[PDB]
Design a protein around this ligand. Sequence first.
Ligand SMILES: CCCCC[C@H](O)/C=C/[C@H]1[C@H](O)CC(=O)[C@@H]1C/C=C/CCCC(=O)O
Length: 947
Amino acid sequence: VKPNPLQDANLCSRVFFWWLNPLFKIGHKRRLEEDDMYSVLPEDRSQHLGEELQGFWDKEVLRAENDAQKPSLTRAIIKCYWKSYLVLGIFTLIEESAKVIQPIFLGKIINYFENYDPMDSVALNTAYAYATVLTFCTLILAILHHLYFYHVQCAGMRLRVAMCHMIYRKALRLSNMAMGKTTTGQIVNLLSNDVNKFDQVTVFLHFLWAGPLQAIAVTALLWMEIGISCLAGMAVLIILLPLQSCFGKLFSSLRSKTATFTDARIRTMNEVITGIRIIKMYAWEKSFSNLITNLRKKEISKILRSSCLRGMNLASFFSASKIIVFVTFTTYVLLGSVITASRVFVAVTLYGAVRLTVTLFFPSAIERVSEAIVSIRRIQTFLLLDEISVGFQAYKNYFRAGAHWIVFIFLILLNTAAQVAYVLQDWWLSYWANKQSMLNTEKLDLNWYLGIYSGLTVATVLFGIARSLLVFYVLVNSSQTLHNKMFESILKAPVLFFDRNPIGRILNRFSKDIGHLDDLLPLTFLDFIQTLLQVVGVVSVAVAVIPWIAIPLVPLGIIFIFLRRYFLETSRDVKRLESTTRSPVFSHLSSSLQGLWTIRAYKAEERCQELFDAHQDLHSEAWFLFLTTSRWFAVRLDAICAMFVIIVAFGSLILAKTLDAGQVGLALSYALTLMGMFQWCVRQSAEVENMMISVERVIEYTDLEKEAPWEYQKRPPPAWPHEGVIIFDNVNFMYSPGGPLVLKHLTALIKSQEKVGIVGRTGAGKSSLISALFRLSEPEGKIWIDKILTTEIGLHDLRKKMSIIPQEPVLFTGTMRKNLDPFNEHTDEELWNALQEVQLKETIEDLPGKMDTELAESGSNFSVGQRQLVCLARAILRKNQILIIDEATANVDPRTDELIQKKIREKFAHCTVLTIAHRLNTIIDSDKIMVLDSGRLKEYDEPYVLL
Ligand SMILES: CCCCC[C@H](O)/C=C/[C@H]1[C@H](O)CC(=O)[C@@H]1C/C=C/CCCC(=O)O
């Protein structure tokens, strides 16, 4: 088979995942397909994860049913998986007591500088010990965390694989009564949407008892340094939850109404893309343009506000750590105390450690657990019922369609000032401290020192708020202007581009690509640039204090660029192995649920269980690699993220003779903040470059074929239907640019007011004479129509004067006044006269409005007879001279067809008609007939000679 090295691998070799290199050495050159991924451990099969839980649940049900109570399932899980989490809790108890010891040994190094005598070696080694205790917590946090994370992630897939097994095992004991009620759709939703929530629960399960413990320890440590003034920093940290939950539940409404706005646009686009051969022939391209532009305008007007909300939320998350420190320290200073450099940065670090975890992790865990319990209750209710007896162009084209480059020069200067203020606000405190220490009572004036601080604090907020809104606007205008180009381009592409491409493709494009452009890109771009600018400030602050930390940074910045590619090469292959191996599970489940009776008839109900186990083991294999390949990278990254700190600290120590406390504390407090942002910065770029493919494929349009224009300048006479004389020549056809000809040398002669009929063999080019008059596909040759050609005149000026009668009518979503006259150019009584002349006046009398009778379901409420009648009404009201009749007889014999034929024969004042048909009897009494052979034509004078 494929023995995996996860076993037979000593310790100190699976902490760095040293056993997973050959896979990368292989995938680097060959694109492993399916047979290069290892198997699973023995204790990860389904037969081993399904039987034990089934036994526990059966024992629970028995014990319960014994005494009068209701049985539960959340007690049969915990009875099996308690030792695992009992052991996993020790670590999270050990790593939460390390984020509290760093700031306590950071405040003891700084204290060496305030009291510094160069000729004293008994107090310099103790500082080295303090700094050494500070390099053992970073290793724990950064290196030993990625194995505990893998294990707590693997502790969920076991549950998710155990549930599905018993679920399926239950789906083969159902009785007829209980089966006919529930639909298979819900049984598959159980497995496709619910169990998939057990992979995130166990991750967010320890933030419920380790969140309320960290805050107490931190607010008890703060009291020993500064005092009561700590409370003034914990009140600006509990208000954010109220002031954000309500705003989010307000935000949801905008999204709801935006969706209910945009659904109609997609519906109308679906209705347009199908039936384009009728619109392009009736010249009705503008109405849809207008009633699409309106909806798009409304959608944009409703999206702007949501975008502003999200931008303000991001800007509030950016600069919340500056409103706490300002208040607490202005209070600590106004009460009567003095300021030093050993308390400030300790408090800074503690605040930064608390606010993040509390306000970002405590809320999500509750939602996760609630969803999990809901899913568990659903599955429980199920299990108890009865049984049986790219490139840079793709960025320019997307950024230069948003605004002039002046805006791209303004937002740069707007982004490169918020960070400057973010750093100067902190530098001011070090300046204050170093000026205080030099005293011996000539105290310090508070006005200056305390006003400059408020100024630096306000500028940050203003410059952090403006940027988000500006970026959002600049990035939404781009989509706003691309969609219009796309739409206006599709209304002119010939029909050739349509019959080869399927509707689903274009519609999925218009929906999903635009959704991505309008919803997700700006947020990711903004977060990425923000988290990328924070790091540069950290580095530039650490360098300016110790210029000798620029020599190793270059060796450390060249390994990242190669490692990223060495990983991404084979990281973009496992996703395919996951998806393609996941789909067969649902496929087999659906296939097996239907064909059930044919299974119970025979005593073979376990073979399918073996097949299901086999089909799930492959997904287990392909999922066991995702976690390991995601963890093989974070360790190497955290190695650097942690070596930086060691370098900084030991440099500060071996250079204690040429600096002071303020700047070293400033450097350390910024270096101890690098373990969270680096991962996010390196992780968002992946999503960005993944979803830019929609941008790429959208610009595939905006540059396509383009037929002749709609209107020239050589206008025709005010009325040029005078004498319909459609003469012909040796013109030919070409559907494809180099395809076969379906018509050869059709030189004929049609006279004014002469009803003509065309007969032939179905498939010999009988339905191709239509594509030359309306010139859908520009043919070769000459076609004179009343002393003038059809090639030196715009399409509209021609298509508008030749009325067609299609074979299969179609109705459009709207009133009964639009389908007959979308452009108001006639009078109501005229429409009434036409309708009553087409034998339909009482049919609309029944309905309420008589001018607002909405019809839907693609004209399903009427019969083909009424549809042909209303089309004849269109033709009548149009009142043209030429008339092109087509027919496809598949209706019934009753008075419908007889009446339409009588009307065609009597109503029209013998105005240049020419008919098509297949039934020989339909074409009778005509003047001249056309027999269409397999590519030529041999007509005769009258039907009296034909037979
Ligand atoms: C500004 C945000 C700083 C904190 C983000 C933190 O570094 C999470 C990073 C992500 C990144 O994909 C790599 C990694 O290990 C984390 C993946 C897990 C995310 C969900 C649980 C995060 C969780 O434990 O809560």
